[PDB]
Coordinates of C-alpha atoms and ligand atoms in Angstrom, one line a residue:
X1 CA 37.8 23.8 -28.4
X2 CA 37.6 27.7 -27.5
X3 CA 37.8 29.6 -24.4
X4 CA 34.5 30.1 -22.9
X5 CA 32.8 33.3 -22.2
X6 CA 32.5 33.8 -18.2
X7 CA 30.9 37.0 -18.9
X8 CA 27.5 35.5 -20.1
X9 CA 27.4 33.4 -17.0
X10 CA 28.3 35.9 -14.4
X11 CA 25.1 36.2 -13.4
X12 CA 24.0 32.5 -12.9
X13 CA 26.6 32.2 -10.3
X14 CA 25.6 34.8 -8.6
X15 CA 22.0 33.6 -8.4
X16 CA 23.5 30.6 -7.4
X17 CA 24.9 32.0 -4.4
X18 CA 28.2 32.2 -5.4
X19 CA 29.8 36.3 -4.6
X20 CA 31.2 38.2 -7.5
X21 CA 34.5 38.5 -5.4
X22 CA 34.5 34.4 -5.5
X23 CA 34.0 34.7 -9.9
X24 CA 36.7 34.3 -12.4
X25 CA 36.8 37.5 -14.8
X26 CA 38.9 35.6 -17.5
X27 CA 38.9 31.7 -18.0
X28 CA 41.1 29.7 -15.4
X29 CA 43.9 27.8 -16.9
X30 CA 43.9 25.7 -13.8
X31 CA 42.8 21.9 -14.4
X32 CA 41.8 20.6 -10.7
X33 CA 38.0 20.1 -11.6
X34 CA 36.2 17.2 -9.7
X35 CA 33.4 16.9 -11.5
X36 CA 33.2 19.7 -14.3
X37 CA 35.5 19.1 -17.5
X38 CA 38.9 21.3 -17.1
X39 CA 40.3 21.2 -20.7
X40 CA 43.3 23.2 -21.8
X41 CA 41.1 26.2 -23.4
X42 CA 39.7 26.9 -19.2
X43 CA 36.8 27.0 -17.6
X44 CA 35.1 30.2 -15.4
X45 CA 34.6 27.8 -12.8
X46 CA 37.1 27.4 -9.5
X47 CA 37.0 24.4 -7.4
X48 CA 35.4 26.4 -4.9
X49 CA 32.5 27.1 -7.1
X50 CA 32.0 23.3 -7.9
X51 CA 32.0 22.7 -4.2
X52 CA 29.8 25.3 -3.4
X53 CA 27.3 24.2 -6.5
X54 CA 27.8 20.4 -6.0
X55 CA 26.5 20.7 -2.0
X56 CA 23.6 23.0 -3.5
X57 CA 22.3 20.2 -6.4
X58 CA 22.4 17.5 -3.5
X59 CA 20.6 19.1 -1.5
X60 CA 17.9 20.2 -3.6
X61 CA 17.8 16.7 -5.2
X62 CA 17.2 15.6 -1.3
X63 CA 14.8 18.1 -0.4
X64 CA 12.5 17.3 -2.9
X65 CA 12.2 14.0 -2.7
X66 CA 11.9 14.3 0.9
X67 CA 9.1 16.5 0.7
X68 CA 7.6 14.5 -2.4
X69 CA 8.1 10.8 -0.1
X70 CA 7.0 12.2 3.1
X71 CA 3.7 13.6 2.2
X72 CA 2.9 10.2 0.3
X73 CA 3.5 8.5 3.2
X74 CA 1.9 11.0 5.3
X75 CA -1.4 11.0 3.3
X76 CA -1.6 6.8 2.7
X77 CA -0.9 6.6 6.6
X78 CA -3.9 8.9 7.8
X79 CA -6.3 7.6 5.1
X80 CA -5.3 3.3 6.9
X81 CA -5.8 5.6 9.9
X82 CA -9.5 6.9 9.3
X83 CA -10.2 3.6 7.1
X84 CA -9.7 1.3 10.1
X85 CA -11.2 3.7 12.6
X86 CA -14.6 3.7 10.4
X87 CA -14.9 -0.2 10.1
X88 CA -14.3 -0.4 14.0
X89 CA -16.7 2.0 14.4
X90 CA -19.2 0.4 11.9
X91 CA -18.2 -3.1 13.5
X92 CA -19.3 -1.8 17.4
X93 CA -22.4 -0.3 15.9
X94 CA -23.8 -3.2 14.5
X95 CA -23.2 -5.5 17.5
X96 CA -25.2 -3.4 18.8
X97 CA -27.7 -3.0 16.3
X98 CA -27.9 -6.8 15.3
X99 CA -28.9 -7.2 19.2
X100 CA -31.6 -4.4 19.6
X101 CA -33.0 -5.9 15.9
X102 CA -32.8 -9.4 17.0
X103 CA -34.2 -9.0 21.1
X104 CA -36.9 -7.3 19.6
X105 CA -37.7 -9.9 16.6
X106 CA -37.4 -12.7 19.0
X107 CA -37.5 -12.4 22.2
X108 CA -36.4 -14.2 25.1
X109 CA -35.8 -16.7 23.3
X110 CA -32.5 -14.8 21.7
X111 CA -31.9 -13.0 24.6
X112 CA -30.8 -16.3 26.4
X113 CA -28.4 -17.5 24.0
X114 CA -26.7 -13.7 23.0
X115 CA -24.0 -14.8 24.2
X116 CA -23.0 -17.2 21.1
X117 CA -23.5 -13.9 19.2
X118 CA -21.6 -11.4 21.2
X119 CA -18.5 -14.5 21.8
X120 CA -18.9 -14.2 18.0
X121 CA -18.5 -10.8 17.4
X122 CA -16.2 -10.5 19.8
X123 CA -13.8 -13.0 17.7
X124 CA -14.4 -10.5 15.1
X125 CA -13.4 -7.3 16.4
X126 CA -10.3 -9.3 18.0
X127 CA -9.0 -10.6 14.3
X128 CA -9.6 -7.2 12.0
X129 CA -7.5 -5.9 15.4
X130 CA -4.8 -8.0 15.5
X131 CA -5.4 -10.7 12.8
X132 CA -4.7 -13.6 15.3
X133 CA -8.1 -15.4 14.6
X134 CA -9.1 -17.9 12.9
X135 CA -11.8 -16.8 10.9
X136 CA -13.4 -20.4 9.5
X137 CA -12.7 -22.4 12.7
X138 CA -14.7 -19.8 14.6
X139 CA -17.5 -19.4 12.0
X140 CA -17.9 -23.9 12.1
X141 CA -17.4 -23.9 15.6
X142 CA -20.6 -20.7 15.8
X143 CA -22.9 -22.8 13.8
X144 CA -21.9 -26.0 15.9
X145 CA -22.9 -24.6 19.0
X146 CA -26.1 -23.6 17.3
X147 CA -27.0 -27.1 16.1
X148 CA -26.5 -28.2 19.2
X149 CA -29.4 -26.0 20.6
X150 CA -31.1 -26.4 17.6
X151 CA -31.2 -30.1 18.8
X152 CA -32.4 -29.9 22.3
X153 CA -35.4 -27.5 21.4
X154 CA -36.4 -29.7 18.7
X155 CA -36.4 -32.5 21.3
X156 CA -38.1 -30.6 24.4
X157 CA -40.1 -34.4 24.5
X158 CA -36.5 -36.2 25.5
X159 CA -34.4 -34.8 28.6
X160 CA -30.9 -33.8 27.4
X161 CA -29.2 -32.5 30.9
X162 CA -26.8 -35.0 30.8
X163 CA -23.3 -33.9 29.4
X164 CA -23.2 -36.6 26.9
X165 CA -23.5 -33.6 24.3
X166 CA -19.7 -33.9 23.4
X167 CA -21.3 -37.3 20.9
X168 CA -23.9 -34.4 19.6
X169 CA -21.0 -31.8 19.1
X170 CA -19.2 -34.5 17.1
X171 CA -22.0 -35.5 15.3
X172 CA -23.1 -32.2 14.4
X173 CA -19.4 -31.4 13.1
X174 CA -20.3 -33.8 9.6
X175 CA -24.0 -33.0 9.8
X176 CA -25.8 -29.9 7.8
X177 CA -29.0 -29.4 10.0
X178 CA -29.6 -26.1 7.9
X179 CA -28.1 -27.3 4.5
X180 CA -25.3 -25.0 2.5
X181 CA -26.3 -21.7 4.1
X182 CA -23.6 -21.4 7.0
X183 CA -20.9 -23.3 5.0
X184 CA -21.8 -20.5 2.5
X185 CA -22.2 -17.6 4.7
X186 CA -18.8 -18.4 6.6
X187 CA -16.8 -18.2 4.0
X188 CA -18.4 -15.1 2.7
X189 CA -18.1 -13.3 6.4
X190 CA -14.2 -14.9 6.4
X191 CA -13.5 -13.2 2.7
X192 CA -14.9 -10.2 3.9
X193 CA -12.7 -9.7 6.7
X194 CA -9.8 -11.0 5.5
X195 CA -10.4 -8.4 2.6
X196 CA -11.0 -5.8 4.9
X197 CA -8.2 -6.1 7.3
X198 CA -5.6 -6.7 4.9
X199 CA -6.7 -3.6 2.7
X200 CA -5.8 -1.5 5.4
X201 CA -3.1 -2.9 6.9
X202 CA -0.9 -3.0 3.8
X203 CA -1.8 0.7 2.8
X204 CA -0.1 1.2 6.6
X205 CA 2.9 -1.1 5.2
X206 CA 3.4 0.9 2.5
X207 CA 3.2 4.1 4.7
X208 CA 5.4 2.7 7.1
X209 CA 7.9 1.2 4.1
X210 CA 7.6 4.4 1.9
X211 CA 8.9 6.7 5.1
X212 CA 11.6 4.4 5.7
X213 CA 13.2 5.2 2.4
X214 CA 14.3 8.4 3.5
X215 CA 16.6 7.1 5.3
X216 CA 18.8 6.3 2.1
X217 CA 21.2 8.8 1.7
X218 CA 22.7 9.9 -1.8
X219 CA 26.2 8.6 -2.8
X220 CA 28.9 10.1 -4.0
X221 CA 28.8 9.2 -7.7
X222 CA 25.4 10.9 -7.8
X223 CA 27.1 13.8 -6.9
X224 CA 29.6 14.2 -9.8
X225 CA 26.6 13.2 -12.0
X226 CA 24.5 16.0 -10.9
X227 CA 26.8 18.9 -10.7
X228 CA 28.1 18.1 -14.1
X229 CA 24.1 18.0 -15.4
X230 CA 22.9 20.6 -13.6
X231 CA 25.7 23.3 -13.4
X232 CA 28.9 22.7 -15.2
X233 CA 26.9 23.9 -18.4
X234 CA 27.9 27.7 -16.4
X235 CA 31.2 26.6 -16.5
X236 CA 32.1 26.1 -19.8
X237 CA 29.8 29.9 -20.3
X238 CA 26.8 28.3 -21.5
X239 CA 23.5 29.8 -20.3
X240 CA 21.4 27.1 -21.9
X241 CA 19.2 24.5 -19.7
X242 CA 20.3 20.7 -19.2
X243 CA 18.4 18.8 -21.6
X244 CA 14.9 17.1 -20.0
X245 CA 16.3 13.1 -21.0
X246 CA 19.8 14.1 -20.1
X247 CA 18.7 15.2 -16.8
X248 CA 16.0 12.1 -16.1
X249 CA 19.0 10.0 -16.4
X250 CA 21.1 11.4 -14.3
X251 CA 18.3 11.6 -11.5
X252 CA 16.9 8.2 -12.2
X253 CA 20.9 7.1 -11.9
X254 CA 20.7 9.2 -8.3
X255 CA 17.4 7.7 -7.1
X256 CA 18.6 3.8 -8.8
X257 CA 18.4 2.2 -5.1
X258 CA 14.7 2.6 -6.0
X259 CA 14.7 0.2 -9.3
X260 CA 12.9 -2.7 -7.4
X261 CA 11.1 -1.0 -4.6
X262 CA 9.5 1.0 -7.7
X263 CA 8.5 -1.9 -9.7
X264 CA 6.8 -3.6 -6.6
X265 CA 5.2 -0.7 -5.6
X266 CA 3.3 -0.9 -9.1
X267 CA 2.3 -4.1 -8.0
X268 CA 1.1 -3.7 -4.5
X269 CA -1.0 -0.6 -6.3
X270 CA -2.1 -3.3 -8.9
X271 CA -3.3 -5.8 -5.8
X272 CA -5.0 -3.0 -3.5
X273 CA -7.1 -2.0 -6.8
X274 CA -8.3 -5.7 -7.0
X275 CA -9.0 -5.7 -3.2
X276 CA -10.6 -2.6 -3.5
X277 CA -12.8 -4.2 -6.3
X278 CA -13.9 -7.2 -4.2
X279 CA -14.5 -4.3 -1.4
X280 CA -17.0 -2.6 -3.3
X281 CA -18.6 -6.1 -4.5
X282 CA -18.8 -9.2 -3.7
X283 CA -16.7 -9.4 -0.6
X284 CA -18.8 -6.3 0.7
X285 CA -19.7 -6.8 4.1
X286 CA -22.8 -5.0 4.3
X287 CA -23.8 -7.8 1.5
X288 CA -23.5 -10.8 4.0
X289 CA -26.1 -8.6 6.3
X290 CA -28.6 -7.0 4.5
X291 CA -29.9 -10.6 2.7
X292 CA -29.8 -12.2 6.2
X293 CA -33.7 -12.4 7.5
X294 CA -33.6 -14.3 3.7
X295 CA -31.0 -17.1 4.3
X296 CA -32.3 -17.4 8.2
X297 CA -35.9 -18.3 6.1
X298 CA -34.0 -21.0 4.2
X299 CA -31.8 -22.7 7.1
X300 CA -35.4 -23.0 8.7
X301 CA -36.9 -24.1 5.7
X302 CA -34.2 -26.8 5.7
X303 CA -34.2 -27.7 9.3
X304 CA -38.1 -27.8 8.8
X305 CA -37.7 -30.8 6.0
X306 CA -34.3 -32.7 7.8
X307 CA -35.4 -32.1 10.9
X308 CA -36.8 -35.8 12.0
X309 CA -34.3 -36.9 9.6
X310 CA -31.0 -35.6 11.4
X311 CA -32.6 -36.1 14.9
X312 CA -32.8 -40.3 14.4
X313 CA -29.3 -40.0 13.2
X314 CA -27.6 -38.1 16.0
X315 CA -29.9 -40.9 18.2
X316 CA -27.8 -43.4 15.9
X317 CA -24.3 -43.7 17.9
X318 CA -25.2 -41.1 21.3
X319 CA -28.7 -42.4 22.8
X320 CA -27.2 6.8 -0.3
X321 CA -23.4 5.7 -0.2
X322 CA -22.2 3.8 3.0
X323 CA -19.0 5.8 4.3
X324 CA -17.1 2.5 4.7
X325 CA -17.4 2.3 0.7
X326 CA -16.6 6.3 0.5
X327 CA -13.1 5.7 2.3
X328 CA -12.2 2.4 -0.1
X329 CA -13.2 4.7 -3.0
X330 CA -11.1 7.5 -1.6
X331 CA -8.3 5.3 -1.0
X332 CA -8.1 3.0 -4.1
X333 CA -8.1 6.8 -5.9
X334 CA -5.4 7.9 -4.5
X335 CA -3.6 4.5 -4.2
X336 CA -4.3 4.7 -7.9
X337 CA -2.5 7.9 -8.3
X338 CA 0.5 7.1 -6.6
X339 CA 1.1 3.9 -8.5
X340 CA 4.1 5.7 -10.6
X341 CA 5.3 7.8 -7.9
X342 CA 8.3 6.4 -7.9
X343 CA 9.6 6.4 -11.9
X344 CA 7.9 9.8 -11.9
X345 CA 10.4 11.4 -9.2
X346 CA 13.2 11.9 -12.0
X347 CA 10.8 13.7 -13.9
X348 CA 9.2 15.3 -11.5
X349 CA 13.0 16.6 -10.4
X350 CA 13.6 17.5 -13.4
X351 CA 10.4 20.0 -14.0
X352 CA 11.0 22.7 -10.8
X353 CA 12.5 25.8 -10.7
X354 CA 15.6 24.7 -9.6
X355 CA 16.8 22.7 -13.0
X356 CA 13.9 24.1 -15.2
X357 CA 15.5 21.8 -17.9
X358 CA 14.7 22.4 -21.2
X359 CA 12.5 20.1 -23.5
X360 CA 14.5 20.5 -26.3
X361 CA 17.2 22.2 -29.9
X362 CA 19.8 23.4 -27.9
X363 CA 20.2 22.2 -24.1
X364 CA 23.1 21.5 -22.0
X365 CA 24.0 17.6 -23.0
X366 CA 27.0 17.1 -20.4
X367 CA 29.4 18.0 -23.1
X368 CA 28.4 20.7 -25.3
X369 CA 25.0 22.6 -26.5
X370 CA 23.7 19.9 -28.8
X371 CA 21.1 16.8 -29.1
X372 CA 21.4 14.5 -26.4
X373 CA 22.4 11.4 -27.9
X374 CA 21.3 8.4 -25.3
X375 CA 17.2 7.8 -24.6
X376 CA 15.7 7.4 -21.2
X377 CA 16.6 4.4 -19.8
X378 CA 14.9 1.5 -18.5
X379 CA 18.0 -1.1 -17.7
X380 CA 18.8 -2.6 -14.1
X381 CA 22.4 -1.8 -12.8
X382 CA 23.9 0.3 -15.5
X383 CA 23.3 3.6 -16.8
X384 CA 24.4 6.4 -20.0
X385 CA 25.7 8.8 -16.8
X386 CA 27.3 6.7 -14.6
X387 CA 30.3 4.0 -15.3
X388 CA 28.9 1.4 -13.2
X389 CA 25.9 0.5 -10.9
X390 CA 24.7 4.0 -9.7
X391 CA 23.2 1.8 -6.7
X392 CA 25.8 1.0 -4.2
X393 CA 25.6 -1.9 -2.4
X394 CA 24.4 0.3 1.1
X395 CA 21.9 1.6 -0.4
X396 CA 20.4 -1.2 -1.7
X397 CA 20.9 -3.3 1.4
X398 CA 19.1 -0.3 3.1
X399 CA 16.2 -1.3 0.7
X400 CA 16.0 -4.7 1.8
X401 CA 14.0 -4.6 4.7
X402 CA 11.9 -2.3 3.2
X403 CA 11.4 -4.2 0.1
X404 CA 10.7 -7.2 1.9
X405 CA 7.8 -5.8 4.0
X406 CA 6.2 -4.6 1.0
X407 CA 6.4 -7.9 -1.3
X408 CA 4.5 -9.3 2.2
X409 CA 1.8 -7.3 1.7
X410 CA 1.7 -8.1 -2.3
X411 CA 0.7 -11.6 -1.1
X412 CA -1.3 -10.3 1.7
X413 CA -3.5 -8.6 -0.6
X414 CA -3.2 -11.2 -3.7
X415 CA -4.7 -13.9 -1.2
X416 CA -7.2 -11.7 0.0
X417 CA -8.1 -11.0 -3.7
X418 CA -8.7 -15.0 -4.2
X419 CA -9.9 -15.5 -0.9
X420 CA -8.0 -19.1 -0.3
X421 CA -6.6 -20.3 3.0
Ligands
O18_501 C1 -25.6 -15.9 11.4 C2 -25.1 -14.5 11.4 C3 -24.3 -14.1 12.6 C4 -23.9 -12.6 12.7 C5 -22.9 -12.2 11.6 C6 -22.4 -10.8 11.6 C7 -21.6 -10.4 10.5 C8 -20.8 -9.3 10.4 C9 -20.6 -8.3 11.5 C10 -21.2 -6.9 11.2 C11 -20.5 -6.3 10.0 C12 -21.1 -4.9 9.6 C13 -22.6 -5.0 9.3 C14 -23.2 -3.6 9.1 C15 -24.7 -3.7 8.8 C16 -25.4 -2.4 8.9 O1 -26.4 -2.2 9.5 O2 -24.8 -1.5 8.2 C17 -25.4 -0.1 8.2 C18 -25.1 0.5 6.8 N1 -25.5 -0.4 5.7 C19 -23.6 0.7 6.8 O3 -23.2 1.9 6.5
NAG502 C1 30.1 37.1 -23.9 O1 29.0 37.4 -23.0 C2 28.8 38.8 -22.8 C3 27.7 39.0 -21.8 O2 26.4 38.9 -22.4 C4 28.4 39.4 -24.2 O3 28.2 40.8 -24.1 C5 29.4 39.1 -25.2 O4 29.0 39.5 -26.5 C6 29.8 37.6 -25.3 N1 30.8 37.4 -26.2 C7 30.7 36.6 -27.3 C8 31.9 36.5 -28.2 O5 29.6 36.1 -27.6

């Protein structure tokens, strides 16, 4: 081509650090370039001032998507943090709450057999803790100890001291003595809590997963990629920006090693949305409890009409807004905007004062001040800026782990969704 003008560009280089002792007056003739073009007309660019500029663009690239990562991860983290802290809470209070309603409502007579309740709840609090519970085989084996009582009161004319109850345990495990409404009202408690559990504890996941890609450090073909979009325009005494899709390419070629863990983290924000739908409806647990003096009236209505017929058979072979739905709200929000966080970092890169590159027209292209030929692209293990796969094979096996902890929780949350076990 032409010699370029250093003179129009004296001043960028300064503003990029660089001393005016350090600049080139006249055009070098040298050709010993890394990463900038060094064709036979010159360039105003030494290979100190590539090195100089090629540290600055990596660390700016790294800075803000540290910043950008961390205080994702930081927000998510503290809003599992305050949503599991508020269902503990609400879980101790209403242990406490159920018994003052019920010692009051019945007496004695409830007072002598809290225990099955609190041994209950306590089963509860222990699984949305630690998830080592099984939710179902508590709930069957709840309402078995209950129709076992439910059997000896009924028969206060017969003398049942004997510990021959292991034939009524048995018996009650294929019997119904209050029809469909514990069947139905442990699987609605079990959906609940699995629902509620796993909703926080894969938002922690992704916390935990999203911090741990900081770990993954840029590689070296990223750098020659983003000197050459970001500065070597300077070089051949261009003053124009890089142009927006020339520069989204060479930042989503940088931040590659993210391809999968992006499109996964669309789907975990897809699952959490439909676990924060059952949340806020049908697998609300303040709707297994406020109904309940209701299905208490049916399993006596139906223990009222089977009664003498389940007692000859067991004789036959023995003798304005809750806060718990204002933090799911606040979380599914924010889980919502966050769902392309991780396609939007090249163009959120792309937009700060550091590149400022230009939407157009005439903008930096890599080559000259022209239209960028190549679109944005979308393709897995190649890209227009790079020769090969701009994802080395460290980075991606740094993404492993981390990729794999967050499919877990995609099924976590998609069996939680369907409520199956
Ligand atoms: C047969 C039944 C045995 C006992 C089953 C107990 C089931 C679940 C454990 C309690 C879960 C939280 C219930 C909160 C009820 C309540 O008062 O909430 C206050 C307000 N609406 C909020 O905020
Ligand atoms: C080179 O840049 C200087 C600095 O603005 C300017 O004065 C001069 O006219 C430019 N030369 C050409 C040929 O455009």
């Amino acid at each position: 081509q032409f010699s370029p003008n250093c003179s129009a560009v004296t001043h960028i280089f300064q503003a990029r650090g660089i001393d005016a002792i350090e600049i080139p007056q006249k055009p070098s003739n040298e050709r010993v370039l890394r990463y900038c073009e060094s064709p036979s007309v010159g360039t105003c660019c030494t290979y100190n001032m590539e090195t100089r500029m090629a540290m600055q663009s990596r660390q700016q690239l790294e800075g803000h998507t540290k910043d950008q990562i961390s205080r994702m991860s930081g927000i998510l983290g503290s809003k599992a943090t305050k949503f599991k802290d508020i269902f503990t809470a609400l879980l101790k209070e209403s242990r406490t709450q159920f018994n003052s309603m019920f010692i009051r409502t019945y007496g004695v007579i409830y007072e002598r057999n809290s225990y099955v309740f609190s041994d209950l709840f306590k089963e509860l609090e222990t699984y949305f803790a630690n998830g080592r519970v099984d939710l179902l085989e508590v709930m069957d084996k709840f309402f078995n100890t209950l129709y076992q009582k439910m059997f000896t009161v009924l028969n206060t004319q017969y003398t049942f001291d004997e510990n021959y109850m292991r034939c009524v345990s048995e018996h009650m495990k294929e019997l119904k003595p209050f029809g469909d409404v514990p069947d139905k009202l442990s699987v609605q408690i079990k959906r609940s809590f699995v629902a509620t559990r796993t909703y926080g504890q894969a938002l922690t996941t992704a916390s935990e997963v999203a911090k741990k890609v900081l770990n993954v450090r840029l590689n070296a073909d990223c750098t020659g990629a983003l000197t050459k979009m970001q500065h070597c325009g300077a070089c051949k005494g261009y003053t124009e920006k890089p142009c927006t899709n020339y520069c989204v390419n060479v930042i989503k070629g940088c931040l590659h090693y993210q391809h999968e863990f992006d499109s996964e983290w669309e789907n975990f924000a897809m699952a959490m949305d439909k676990v924060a739908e059952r949340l806020l409806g049908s697998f609300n647990i303040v709707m297994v409890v406020e109904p309940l003096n209701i299905k208490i009236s049916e399993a006596i209505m139906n223990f009222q009409d089977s009664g003498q017929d389940i007692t000859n058979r067991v004789f036959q072979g023995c003798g304005r807004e809750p806060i718990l739905d204002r933090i799911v709200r606040d979380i599914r929000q924010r889980v919502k905007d966050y769902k392309k966080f991780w396609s939007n970092l090249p163009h959120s890169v792309c937009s700060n004062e550091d590149i400022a590159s230009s939407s157009d027209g005439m903008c930096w292209n890599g080559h000259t001040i022209d239209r960028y030929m190549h679109s944005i692209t979308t393709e897995h293990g190649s890209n227009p800026e790079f020769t090969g796969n701009p994802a080395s094979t460290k980075q991606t096996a740094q993404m492993a782990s981390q990729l794999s902890h967050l499919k877990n929780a995609i099924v976590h949350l998609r069996n939680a969704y369907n409520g199956q076990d």
